[PDB]
Design an enzyme around this catalytic site. Structure first.
Site, short mmCIF file in Angstrom:
data_model
loop_
_atom_site.label_atom_id
_atom_site.label_comp_id
_atom_site.label_asym_id
_atom_site.label_seq_id
_atom_site.Cartn_x
_atom_site.Cartn_y
_atom_site.Cartn_z
CG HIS A 58 -0.41 0.10 2.49
ND1 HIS A 58 -0.54 -0.69 3.31
CD2 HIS A 58 0.04 1.26 3.08
CE1 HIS A 58 0.15 -0.30 4.33
NE2 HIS A 58 0.44 0.94 4.54
CG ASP A 101 -0.36 -4.09 2.70
OD1 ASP A 101 -0.05 -3.51 1.64
OD2 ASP A 101 -0.76 -3.68 3.58
CB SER A 196 1.83 1.20 7.24
OG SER A 196 2.06 2.04 6.15
N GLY A 197 4.42 -0.50 6.68
CA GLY A 197 5.60 -0.92 5.85
C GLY A 197 6.65 -1.20 6.71
C1 LIG Z 1 -1.36 13.52 2.81
C2 LIG Z 1 -0.42 12.58 2.38
C3 LIG Z 1 0.54 12.22 3.37
C4 LIG Z 1 0.41 10.89 4.09
C5 LIG Z 1 1.65 10.52 4.80
C6 LIG Z 1 1.11 10.18 6.07
C7 LIG Z 1 1.40 8.48 6.48
C8 LIG Z 1 0.48 7.79 7.24
N1 LIG Z 1 0.40 6.48 7.21
C9 LIG Z 1 -0.79 5.65 7.23
O1 LIG Z 1 -1.96 6.03 7.48
C10 LIG Z 1 -0.66 4.25 6.54
C11 LIG Z 1 -1.41 4.12 5.21
C12 LIG Z 1 -0.44 5.15 4.30
C13 LIG Z 1 -1.71 6.05 3.94
C14 LIG Z 1 -1.03 6.85 2.82
C15 LIG Z 1 0.11 6.56 2.22
O2 LIG Z 1 0.61 7.50 1.22
C16 LIG Z 1 0.96 8.69 1.27
C17 LIG Z 1 1.82 8.98 0.27
C18 LIG Z 1 1.76 10.30 0.03
C19 LIG Z 1 2.80 10.75 -1.27
N2 LIG Z 1 3.49 10.04 -1.87
C20 LIG Z 1 3.40 8.57 -1.37
C21 LIG Z 1 2.87 8.22 -0.44
C22 LIG Z 1 1.02 5.48 2.75
C23 LIG Z 1 0.39 4.65 3.57
N3 LIG Z 1 -1.09 3.40 7.65
C24 LIG Z 1 -0.42 3.04 8.75
O3 LIG Z 1 0.68 3.31 9.04
C25 LIG Z 1 -1.07 2.01 9.72
C26 LIG Z 1 -2.08 2.70 10.68
C27 LIG Z 1 -2.70 1.74 11.69
C28 LIG Z 1 -1.68 0.92 12.23
C29 LIG Z 1 -2.31 -0.08 13.27
N4 LIG Z 1 -1.48 -0.73 14.11
C30 LIG Z 1 -0.68 0.26 11.39
C31 LIG Z 1 0.05 1.25 10.49
#
Ligand SMILES: CCCCCCCCNC(=O)[C@H](Cc1ccc(OCc2ccncc2)cc1)NC(=O)[C@H]1CC[C@H](CN)CC1
Length: 246
Positions: A58, A101, A196-197
């Site tokens: 993701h 994922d 994440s990752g």
């Molecule tokens: C406005 C765009 C900036 C977003 C950057 C903040 C990244 C926050 N990441 C997440 O929300 C990712 C999902 C994610 C969302 C967007 C992402 O992409 C943002 C991006 C923006 C520009 N270029 C590349 C990627 C990447 C990952 N999920 C997790 O970290 C999980 C949350 C719940 C936990 C439960 N134990 C497990 C970890």
């Protein structure tokens, strides 16, 4: 130099990311930060060999262009990177083909392996991490008022076997065999947005083995809501095949 996988040169705190603690710097030397071309952190990853990083699929779904990504190795501070930090552009992306994922990044040049940049060990194929095994997650994600924002944190989480994690009170059937659960029943300690990752590692006799990739959860650190991780052992044959053939 030669450094064994999974053996930090700075012994980790292992304090018994929301909750947990700030890691000793460079005590999780496989932890990487996946960043945009402008250097903004958006995901974790794990160095598994000098040219290969394992992360969540993701984290890569918005861009199939390897030039959209760079990997930061050897870091402790998120913002003010240390002088020895290596910044390496990604050369190729390999998404797991059954759309799970998990994904591999091939680096444009091999990371220089030092006392601060060392790969994690991969598990044996199809290994099952037993219920209650103590593991650790690391990352630069959200802290939800538990201090240490901007520094690499760690948290100790016990694995919860899938048959327990899938009970109604917990994740109510959602967890697949290719995933694993880890967390504390009472909540308060967990991976969170920005983690994440990244890795979930479990110590085995004298080294840390990468058993999970931080994937998803129903919020962070809520009671009865453990985090879900991709079960790395179910992908070792695929990972090894990608590395062997690229
Ligand atoms: C406005 C765009 C900036 C977003 C950057 C903040 C990244 C926050 N990441 C997440 O929300 C990712 C999902 C994610 C969302 C967007 C992402 O992409 C943002 C991006 C923006 C520009 N270029 C590349 C990627 C990447 C990952 N999920 C997790 O970290 C999980 C949350 C719940 C936990 C439960 N134990 C497990 C970890």
């Amino acid at each position: 130099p030669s450094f064994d996988c999974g053996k930090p040169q700075v012994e980790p705190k292992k304090c018994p990311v929301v909750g947990g603690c700030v890691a000793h710097p460079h005590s999780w030397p496989w932890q990487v930060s996946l960043r945009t071309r402008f250097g903004m952190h958006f995901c974790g990853g794990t160095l598994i060999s000098p040219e290969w990083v394992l992360t969540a699929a993701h984290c890569l779904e918005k861009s199939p262009r390897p030039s959209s990504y760079k990997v930061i190795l050897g870091a402790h501070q998120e913002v003010n990177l240390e002088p020895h930090v290596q910044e390496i552009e990604v050369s190729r992306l390999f998404l797991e083909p059954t759309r799970k994922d998990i994904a591999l990044l091939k680096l444009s040049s091999p990371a220089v392996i030092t006392d601060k940049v060392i790969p994690a060990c991969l598990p044996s194929p199809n290994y099952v991490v037993a219920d209650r095994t103590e593991c650790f997650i690391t990352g630069w994600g959200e802290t939800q008022g538990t201090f240490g924002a901007g520094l690499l944190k760690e948290a100790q989480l016990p694995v919860i076997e899938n048959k327990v994690c899938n009970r109604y009170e917990f994740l109510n059937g959602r967890v697949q065999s290719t995933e694993l659960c880890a967390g504390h029943l009472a909540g308060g300690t967990d991976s969170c947005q920005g983690d994440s990752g990244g890795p979930l590692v479990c110590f085995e006799k004298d080294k840390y083995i990468l058993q999970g990739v931080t994937s998803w959860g129903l919020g962070c650190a809520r009671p009865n809501k453990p985090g879900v991780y991709v079960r790395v052992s179910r992908f070792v044959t695929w990972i090894e095949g990608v590395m062997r053939n690229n």
